[PDB]
Design a binder for these strands. Structure first.
Lengths: 195, 192
DNA sequence: CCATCAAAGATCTTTGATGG
DNA sequence: CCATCAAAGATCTTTGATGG
């Protein structure tokens, strides 16, 4: 089945414009690489997790593609081996509204992130106040104008590309509210990179 | 701070442990318990030349020793002699019994953080961690966690056994009282 | 009934208070 | 201005709730 549990299959074809995509990366040892992308329709942007590396080229910025038999997990799309992805016909193309492009690249305030439900996937670019390397984890204190929060990565550390002073790019991190002590924690598909 | 007592005191030796390594690069130490006519004292001995002197029921006269909040500490600068008969005496039965008794855990929990704790307790559970070994000990009223993080070698006691503790430190932090190993801590046990 | 992953809690490391 | 050492704080593990 889908890499995201509970994800629902959508057979109906949908045409999107690719806004951005990450390099592929190893998310789990012994498994094929994945990448993250953001795509948009005339009315909505979607975060997308792509598990078929045949599709690297099709996820080029500003390209229009038609996707079918993809999975939807709480608004996050998953494209795996069973999906069909083709280049869109010129007649299937459209203009993405500016507000949608803007929202797709925006990062929520940390204070607002903290109000979301536990388990919500968090994406964004944040200033780093401190980085701490431990044996079983790397932690970051990230911050903005108004607030700060801890980011916890407990996965393989070798391939993280982050340099002192960089802003931190987060993809698919999980909000954990704990009990008034919230953090962002890596999960199965999380990706982290300096900007 | 510990108080130096230059004047001689004659005591009877009640019990003493075998010597053990308490700190890397240091001479061994042992624990003992001794008594006068009127009081018992727990004792820490750091001069191993004195081990034969600390045999059960022996009367010894101690001088230039330290009293550290009720615990006597005997190092190289102390003088320890065999007592003269005229300094010998009878240790009353209630003093000997008090020397051997263990505080209820419910009373231990009320003491100040940092108080040194000794006693014999039933073991309820043992857990081995990466860098510590912990035990749950109990009596008829209460239970408490013991933490050993000094050497990470096997402590071969488990549920049903009895654990004898020497100079463990009470920590109350977080409203969660524990007994924690410290500089001079030692564990003996009775296998089941 | 395993797998998941967040909440709860234990363990481990750092800080800070105290004294000599 | 070392040495202790317990609390605070951070990391790490265990537990418990959910869902295919």
């Amino acid at each position: 089945g889908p890499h995201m549990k509970g994800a629902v299959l959508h057979e109906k074809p949908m045409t999107v414009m690719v806004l951005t995509a990450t390099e592929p990366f190893n998310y789990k040892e012994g498994k094929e690489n994945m990448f993250h992308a953001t795509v948009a329709t005339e009315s909505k942007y979607y975060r997308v997790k792509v598990f078929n590396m045949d599709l690297k080229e099709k996820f080029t910025e500003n390209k229009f593609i038609t996707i079918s038999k993809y999975f939807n997990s709480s608004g996050i799309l998953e494209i795996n081996e069973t999906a069909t992805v083709s280049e869109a016909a010129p007649n299937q193309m459209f203009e993405v509204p500016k507000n949608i492009i803007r929202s797709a690249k925006e990062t929520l305030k940390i204070s607002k992130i903290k109000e979301l439900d536990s388990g919500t996937l968090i994406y964004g670019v944040f200033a780093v106040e401190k980085k701490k390397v431990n044996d079983k984890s790397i932690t970051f204190k990230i911050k903005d104008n108004e607030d700060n929060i801890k980011v916890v990565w407990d996965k393989e550390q070798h391939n993280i590309n982050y340099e002192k002073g960089d802003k931190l790019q987060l993809f698919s991190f999980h909000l954990r509210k704990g009990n008034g002590k919230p953090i962002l924690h890596s999960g199965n598909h999380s990706f982290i990179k300096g900007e």
